[PDB]
């Protein structure tokens, strides 16, 4: 009953909350994280859209200040990465995401689209074939899919996914998590082990090249780019986190969220050309991401309340992509949705996710197979989904389903 329902980490059902802070307080400050919480769209957008005062520089600060003894740890370790893009600020960013652009060029996307589609394949089938015919949609089909890509991607060994899914859980919980000064300890030292990964592919395509973005950003190095090898290393360590985290929550909700409306599950069983629309209004229904924030550079205001320069910015899209001002029964989820695209769980301005398509990618493909191999697909109960708490990233644990066989 307090903040008006607002539970900042909670991430299993925050949408009534949202929904009487769009009406009763749309900028509210909340003293327990220390952030100004915006939950209206226009607000919103036109937060993004003015970078020159909102400045993305805390993004990547955690939540919750670095302990005494993950400072120490972090720091022996030569842990030296904040943000690979996504808290940088021009002329920094510019420069940087520039270069990035020019090795995540998307005939990479479309050119090895077959072997995402025969890898969820390969999933779905050893799914359907185990003593119980009850499966996990999280760790059957989404845990390895996008993370597998991500790394063919760029020039890891897929042989560590369970070692990135490990490093991906400990930097979404230091940076976003409500954690102590001992819960930092576990997740400190793996940000130490994935950073000294991401210098040690870094010197590996400097001595022996390759074929991936990490020989890419280095040979562009080589031919004169404005990049050095921290900036390397650090495009890495965004991109082996956001290139999957996000994408495998993604195709977790699209079976959460469809399987809780049988009907649309239905329509996509008789038209599969409904899929690509389907995934646009999971995202505004159901985003990966449902909070960002932003740094206000000067005394300034966000829907006539006045903020300070160095004030913390919450901007709560989750909130946004559901405001009855731009969404008509922004509630209910709707696949036939005409202007679902105007979400904004992707962001917008300069800091628009880079492999935006990559997701949506394989998170369509995912739906064509698995609805075409598994028909009959479906929950096991109502109420066995569980959700990490978390600032921002809104992940469920689980998706268990079963099938007729
Ligand atoms: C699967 C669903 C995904 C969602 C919902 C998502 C969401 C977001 C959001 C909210 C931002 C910040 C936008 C802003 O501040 O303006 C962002 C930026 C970014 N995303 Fe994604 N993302 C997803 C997948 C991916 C994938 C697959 C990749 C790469 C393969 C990726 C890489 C990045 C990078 C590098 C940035 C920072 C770009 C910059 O700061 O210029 N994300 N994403
Ligand atoms: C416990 C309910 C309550 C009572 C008085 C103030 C208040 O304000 P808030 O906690 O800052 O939202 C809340
Ligand atoms: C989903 C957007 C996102 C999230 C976390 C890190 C990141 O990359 P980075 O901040 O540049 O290291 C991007």
């Known amino acids: 009953t307090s903040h008006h329902g607002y539970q900042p980490f909670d991430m299993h059902n925050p949408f009534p909350a949202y929904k009487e802070l769009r009406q009763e307080e749309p900028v509210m400050f909340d003293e327990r994280i220390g952030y100004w919480v915006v939950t209206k769209y226009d607000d919103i957008k036109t937060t993004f859209d003015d970078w020159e005062t909102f400045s993305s520089e805390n993004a990547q600060a955690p939540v919750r200040k670095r302990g005494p003894q993950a400072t120490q740890i972090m720091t022996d370790g030569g842990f030296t990465a904040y943000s690979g893009l996504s808290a940088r600020i ?45 499966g996990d949609m999280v760790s059957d089909l989404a845990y390895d899919i996008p993370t597998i890509t991500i790394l063919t991607l760029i020039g890891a060994d897929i042989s560590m996914v369970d070692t990135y899914k490990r490093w991906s859980d400990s930097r979404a919980a230091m940076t976003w998590g409500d954690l102590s000064d001992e819960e930092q300890i576990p997740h400190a030292h793996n940000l130490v082990e994935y950073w000294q990964e991401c210098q040690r592919m870094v010197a590996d395509a400097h001595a022996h090249g390759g074929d991936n973005l990490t020989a890419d950003l280095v040979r562009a190095q080589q031919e004169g780019q404005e990049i050095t090898d921290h900036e390397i290393a650090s495009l890495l360590y965004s991109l082996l986190f956001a290139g999957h985290e996000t994408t495998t929550t993604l195709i977790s909700n699209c079976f959460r969220v469809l399987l809780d409306h049988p009907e649309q599950w239905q329509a996509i069983l008789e038209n599969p050309k409904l899929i690509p629309a389907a995934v646009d209004e999971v995202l505004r229904y159901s985003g990966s991401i449902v909070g960002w924030r932003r740094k206000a550079l000067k005394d300034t205001e966000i829907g006539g309340v006045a903020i300070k320069e160095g004030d913390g910015v919450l901007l709560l899209m989750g909130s946004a992509n559901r405001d009855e001002a731009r969404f008509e029964n922004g509630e209910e989820f709707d696949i036939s949705r005409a202007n679902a695209r105007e979400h904004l769980s992707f962001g917008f301005g300069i800091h628009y996710c880079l492999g935006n398509m990559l997701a949506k990618l394989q998170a369509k493909i995912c739906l064509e197979e698995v609805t075409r191999l598994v028909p009959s697909l479906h929950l096991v109960a109502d109420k066995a989904i569980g959700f990490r708490e978390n600032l921002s990233f809104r992940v469920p644990t689980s998706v268990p389903v079963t099938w007729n066989a």
């Not at 589609?117 to 003593?131: F, G, H, P, T």
């Open 90 to 134: 021009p002329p920094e960013h510019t420069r940087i995401r520039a270069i990035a652009q020019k090795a995540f060029t998307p005939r990479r996307y479309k050119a090895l689209e077959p072997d995402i589609r025969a890898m969820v394949i390969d999933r779905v089938e050893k799914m359907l074939a185990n003593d119980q015919h009850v």
